[PDB]
Structure 1
């Protein structure tokens, strides 16, 4: 059916989790890591 995102390729559950992980789950912690790195006192 064409009412939902699906995948006929192998392991179609991978984009189901990788897309949230890379685009709106991990990026904020990554920004936090970079912020700490660039604000560290000498």
Structure 2
């Protein structure tokens, strides 16, 4: 899974974060916020 464009290593780390890390992070943050019973 290699490319000839400049800095070919970027999608190797950027896509997983946009694929796994960022989605899970915002998923958990939003889940915590919507069930936050601190106020109304």
Q: Same fold (TM over 0.5)?
A: yes
| Equivalent residues, number | 38
TM-score (norm 2): 0.75
4+ residue runs over 4 A deviation? none
Give the aligned partner of residue 8 of structure 2.
12
Gaps of 5+ in 2: none
Gaps of 5+ in 1: none
Alignment root-mean-square deviation, CA: 1.1
Question: Deviations 1:2-42 (Å, cap 9, x if unpaired)?
Answer: xxx11111111000111111111221121000011111111
